[PDB]
Specification:
Layout: no helix or strand
The structure holds one RNA strand.
PDB class: ribosome
Keywords: 30S ribosomal subunit, protein-RNA complex
Entry title: Crystal structure of five 70s ribosomes from Escherichia Coli in complex with protein Y.
RNA sequence: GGUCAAGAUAGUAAGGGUCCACGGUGGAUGCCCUGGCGCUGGAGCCGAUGAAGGACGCGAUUACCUGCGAAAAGCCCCGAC
């Protein structure tokens, strides 16, 4: 997040996936994850690079034409 | 009252039947927004920038279906609200 890459092409976000999506799969597990905690902070930030790879093949298509 | 007597013929009927009360899994009529028939008026497929429709596909479950399968209930934009 956010919609900040509406103006930034330079492969920095290239490893942005390595951020929270690295051990939130280690919170996506069964038990000791979040039942009464803040359960929602999983696939509520898993569209973290999804629906954001749009205008990424319809904007980032900027190669040379 | 009584000894004797037959004559006269009486109830129960284990079970049942003429009549009522209380009743079944089943169940139609009265009746119910979608589900069927005949129809007016319009519209009347997409097409290797690849279609009908299926198979196996996401939400702390997913199996008959909504969308979509991994960017699977949905994303540019303008817009309704």
């Amino acid at each position: 997040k956010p919609s900040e890459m509406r103006n930034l092409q330079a492969t920095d976000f290239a490893k942005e996936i390595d951020a929270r999506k690295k051990e939130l799969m280690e919170l996506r597990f069964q038990a000791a994850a979040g039942q009464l905690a803040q359960p929602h902070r999983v696939r509520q930030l898993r569209r973290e690079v999804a629906q954001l790879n749009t205008v990424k093949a319809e904007l980032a298509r900027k190669g040379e034409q």
